[PDB]
Amino acid sequence: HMIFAKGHGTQNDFVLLPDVDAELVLTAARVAALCDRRKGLGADGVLRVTTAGAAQAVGVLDSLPEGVRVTDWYMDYRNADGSAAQMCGNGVRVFAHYLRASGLEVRDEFVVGSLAGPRPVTCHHVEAAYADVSVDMGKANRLGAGEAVFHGLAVDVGNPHLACVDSQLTVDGLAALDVGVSFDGAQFPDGVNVEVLTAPVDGAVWMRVHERGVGETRSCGTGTVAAAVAALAAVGSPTGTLTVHVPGGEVVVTVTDATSFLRGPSVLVARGDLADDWWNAMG
Template identity: 75%
Template structure:
């Protein structure tokens, strides 16, 4: 059972090639695989398959809107084994893997997800590194909310990027660095009944913001692709703008996000770190 380990701005994933979607990704097994002591360790798992194969295997009951049966499909699982609609950093790593492995020869193609189709452009890709732009779709605001992170209360903008976010603008850089983002969080459960990813970020200065994120089902991660999009929407709104481009600095590096009237774009790096084989005995035991 082969795997690849990769990351996008240090948001790391185990990539599982499974073109026929035959693997059983039970939550307990995914959680064990993502555990940094008893498994390989990762923020999530990316199953590589096609939308048609995933449909036939019962991964979902119908194709996601806008996704064709022949499209590549990123079946993304959080570190706790739960299913997630979308992951911007994961799409970059997924697309990089397809090109590096020879499964895809084009530099522009579509990656399907539960949140819909995500067109990608590979500006550069080799066996180890890539630079990828993902069209992330329209980011929609749906109100304001509040959360407690690291013992501090924050108000923020609710943003749907195919998954829910609360982006809170205004902390200064020194306080952001000291904040315990990994601590348990609380938030408006009425506004976010299925949980929420929470971004804490500085106001824009010279076209850039700094951000940290608490991802639902994971905790603090070094980066969150959809989170950088939500953060950019909130940072622009903080300046009275609906569109624009910002550099977003996260603990794992830097990405560039562009918001237009109709869609959004995320550009950043991908790194494929290792390739190997999972023990079948270990995998079967993890499912027990």
């Protein structure tokens, strides 16, 4: 009698827990057991579906992020290791898809609240199992050049990035060992996500991320936005649309004057019930 769903976007997979009134107690141990591929259900993170006001009432949220109303849908995102929504902006597509398909939300256009702020979404097509969702990821700020190892552009998409377009990089060359590097500390005093990518060839780009601390880890929403921004800017365009090939598949970034949008697939594989006894005995 504990409702859940299992979904994924490009790469990352999520367990969704509908909990409008935030009655569930998401201990670190419960999240970890639920994310364990053998002992639980297996996921990169848990997305508890609630509202910002309910989250703030139950202690999950202290004060509201700027732009997030007490009545907003709220994606209470937890990493497998109990920890809370690292900067990526991940989870929003699958979250939005869940809202639509489960009938919690009837409109194709609505706002997803999150720790990092409001994320307006557009649901282009929605079926039970598949959806095509656009996330308004926010203003992307180009902020000057920097070296890495590569020479790129500091792009601010809620958090610092350094996306590096390399004309002399191929898709095969991009199979380089960029797990666990060097960047200028004065330019990024509080660390930086480092993207490395091919030159825009026919509206498309191939990239890989190395997010701060977590190492080379899966797909990065905001980092994908940073990558496309830097690629457009290298072709002389402050705004445009690029397909971005990322580990797991492809997504489409749109940059406007005001903001940026990330558009990609979402899949919901399963829906059902966690056993109540199992939930209790998990820490």
